[PDB]
């Protein structure tokens, strides 16, 4: 979970233009303004319906969120785009507060960023990197509400399959809105078609103003099949009494590659 509200160390770098970020890069989320550290780069196909879907390779990052700006599925663990990263420099030998931080990074003033992969991390990257080939990135805009979805395959355990999903919601306008209802359609490979219509997202009814323009949450979906496609609508309410359905662009839930 995270809304956008306020921030508060370091020196600010220039966002990179023709280069990927390095393991150990400290950054603030350019939207949620948390303190984070880069773990490794990851190339995802991005299906952005707002070029008007011939998906283009785009550099994403697995990342550790500082536990002071927060409370497979590890708590401080998150994915951010290249654009999400405002890079910066500290000289704290502990710049990010998180249980995984020391396990993954050795401090060492030799190099920049000044934190190196503990080989605990290289094993982790090698373990995770395959499964992430199952994570495409979907984004579509309706009525100045931009939706981003990434599915992540959790594993399996009759035979049941688990995905988590990041959804981000962004008000691009100044007009105030609030998420009120979700209406999921989940269509399995079995030909089962589940549906879900309810108040809010994970307990929340987020208000999106240019004072708090963005919300990101994580939830999970279960099938009794190797694969399926999922899509739906969020219903938003305006102060003027009106309401509109923001499309969640279709994404896919996968287990095998070929
Ligand atoms: Na370097």
Residue numbers in the entry: 49 to 56, 65 to 108, 126 to 144, 168 to 253, 258 to 358
Reported in the publication:
Polymerase δ‐interacting protein 2 (POLDIP2, PDIP38) is a multifaceted, “moonlighting” protein, involved in binding protein partners from many different cellular processes, including mitochondrial metabolism and DNA replication and repair. 4 This is followed by two predicted globular YccV and ApaG/DUF525 domains, with putative functions in bacterial homologues of hemi‐methylated DNA binding (YccV) 5 and nucleotide binding (ApaG). 7 , 8 POLDIP2 stimulates Polδ by increasing its binding to PCNA, a homotrimeric ring‐shaped processivity factor for DNA synthesis, 7 potentially by bridging the molecules, with the POLDIP2 NTD required for full stimulation. 9 POLDIP2 directly stimulates PrimPol DNA binding, synthesis and processivity during translesion bypass.
Here we report the crystal structure of the POLDIP251‐368 fragment to 2.8 Å, demonstrating that it has a rigid core structure with closely packed extended YccV and DUF525 domains, confirmed by solution scattering and molecular dynamics simulations. The POLDIP251‐368 structure was solved with molecular replacement, using bacterial HspQ (YccV) 14 and human FBxo3 (DUF525), 15 with one molecule in the asymmetric unit and R work/R free factors of 0.216/0.288 respectively, 99.67% completeness and 99.6% of residues in preferred or allowed Ramachandran regions. The POLDIP251‐368 crystal structure exhibits a globular fold, with the YccV‐like and DUF525 domains juxtaposed on top of each other. The YccV‐like α1 helix leads immediately into a presumed “linker” region between the YccV and DUF525 domains, comprising the α2/310 helix (residues 201–230). Instead, we propose this region is part of an extended YccV (E‐YccV) domain. The E‐YccV domain is connected by a short linker (Ser231‐Asp232) to the DUF525 domain (residues 233–368), which exhibits a fibronectin type III/immunoglobulin (β‐sandwich) fold, comprising two opposing four‐stranded antiparallel β‐sheets. Part of the N‐terminal loop was structured in the crystal (residues 49–66), comprising the short β0 strand formed partly from Met50 (remaining following tag cleavage). β0 hydrogen bonds with the distal β15 strand of the upper β‐sheet, thereby connecting DUF525 to the N‐terminal region. On closer examination we observed an internal cavity traversing the protein at the interface (dashed boxes), lined with predominantly hydrophilic residues contributed from both E‐YccV and DUF525 domains (inset). During structural refinement we observed that Cys266 exhibited electron density that could not be accounted for, either by alternative rotamers or by surrounding residues (green). Protein mass spectrometry also confirmed the expected molecular weight, furthermore, a mass difference reflecting the size of the density was not observed (not shown). This prompted us to speculate that this could reflect an oxidized (or other) post‐crystallization modification of Cys266, given its exposure to the cellular environment via the channel.
